Design a protein around this nucleic acid. Sequence first.
RNA 1: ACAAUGGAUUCUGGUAUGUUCUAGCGCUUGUACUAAGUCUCAUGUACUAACAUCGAUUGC
Lengths: 27, 403, 48, 70, 49
Amino acid sequence: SYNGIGLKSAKGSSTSGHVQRSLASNN
Amino acid sequence: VIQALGGIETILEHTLFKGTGFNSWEGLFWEKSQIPNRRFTLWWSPTINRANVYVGFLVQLDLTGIFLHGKIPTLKISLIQIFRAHLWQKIHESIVFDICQILDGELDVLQIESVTKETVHPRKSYKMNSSAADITMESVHEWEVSKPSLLHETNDSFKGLITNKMWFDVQLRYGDYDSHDISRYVRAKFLDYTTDNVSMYPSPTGVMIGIDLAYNMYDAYGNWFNGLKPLIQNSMRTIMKANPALYVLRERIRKGLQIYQSSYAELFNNDIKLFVDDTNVYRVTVHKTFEGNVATKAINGCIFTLNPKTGHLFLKIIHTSVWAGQKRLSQLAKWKTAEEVSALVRSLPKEEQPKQIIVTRKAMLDPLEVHMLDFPNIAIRPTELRLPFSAAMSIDKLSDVVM
Amino acid sequence: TEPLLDILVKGETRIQNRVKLGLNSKMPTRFPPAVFYTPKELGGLGMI
Amino acid sequence: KDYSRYQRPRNVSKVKSIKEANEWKRQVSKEIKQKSTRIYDPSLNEMQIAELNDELNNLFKEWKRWQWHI
Amino acid sequence: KEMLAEARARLLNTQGKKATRKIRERMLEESKRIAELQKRRELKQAGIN
RNA sequence: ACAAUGGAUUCUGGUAUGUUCUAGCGCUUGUACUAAGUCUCAUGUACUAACAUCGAUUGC
């Protein structure tokens, strides 16, 4: 969910806006 | 990046590499490092004009079976120039002619009373909606056919149906990156056309040969009575390499893609060298009309070669009954002379075989260069110096054997 | 730098859209990464 | 009715029909009008009238030929 | 002297293509009218009006 | 202890443009001699692309 991360929109970004959590950052 | 995109063989599946007729991507260089746009989009045409389009109105080109998904004008100009001068129709008549020339060569083991090519609608060759039969086989004894199976099927159970007449259908498609499996296409069209009522076949239990003109692939799906499945897969391997119409298809792709493939004292030495004269093959003598006309008469010719070390002659008589069923006949002659040079090479053992072959006129070299490529040690050269020839036709003994 | 990485994405897709404007299609399926990123010896653009 | 591909044509014998010749004859009079207009010009160059003058002699000779056949 | 003649010809020509084309067209139209009027006068001498 | 996935195509593109092409009435005067068409290939020329052309090493 949009927990403060990601984009305002994917319209002008030229990306998809797909956010996935970094499995590397845990501790 | 080539490892990232799946190796070279995955990249070339996106392209028109197999349409060029090149066997492998070895020693292949582009010629012109800036390339223009017309030959960029023609190279990537199976993945630019692919069938996974999101939206695009299906049109068909006016003389061919290429379907365009929308409007790419830079590609359409290249496909008109490659498929110009009714090439889609002229390819389809060439395979139908070449199948008929192979059926009557082995007509006794098949036991046909006649093999007939039908009157073909000129719109039929690029009609993807329905089809008809091309070549009809009538049998003396009643054939027992199998279940309809693919061309490279192992075994067949011939106890199914007992029929007296078979048919051929020659299908031509133009593949994409998405849909170019010819084995799926021919199975789908065979099981659709025989169940359709509008598509008119004379009998059931026929076969259908499909050729993808974009990836030079071929497949056959239909039921076989006996003997044709080893015969028709040996025949199509010779047709897909030596067709004069597919050679024009592959040549017009190589001109649009601009791709070339890299890699007097010696005449009498111990190296074996064939000097080929094809003037003797084609002869026409004028016959006077009652009023005014040109007679369609040709006298039987012969294919003429010599070796320096052997010091002998090789001769292949050609009778004019072969010339009765085609047009632009003397251009068909170079293909037949090419086959007989390739067979005359093939008959001899490879050490006895020539290291090089020289021909007077290079009008006929390129089909000679096509068929002969069975062994890499063979070089082909023009005559530096023109020799006339045809002492053999004036030699009374050789002319008596030909006549 | 996060602003520069958004510039690199938007900058490279403008170069790809120029190839898509030379043709009359910006449709994504017609243009795989094989068209843009294959080297010039294999017939691609050689885009890094 | 067309006849543009057919010459003037200098040969007469080839077309037996006169009614067809009715059309061939206008095919000639029209040029007679064009060039005739092309005869008087503000420049009045000798070279242009001079070639036109030869064309007039050639046409008048043709009129003599059609009269002779009749 | 050749480039001086060319410069002398260039400095004394101030019209342009459209103006020069218009002059040529006007002369042609005037010649066409005079020719047609002469053609009518010659036919009037032959009685045909 | 992460389930988050934007696109997409049509139109406006060097001969443009411009002119003339009265057959069919309007009353009065005024028997001057034999080259077809289509298709394909080759070469030559002209026009045209408002096309492109220099990326790197040596034996006196």
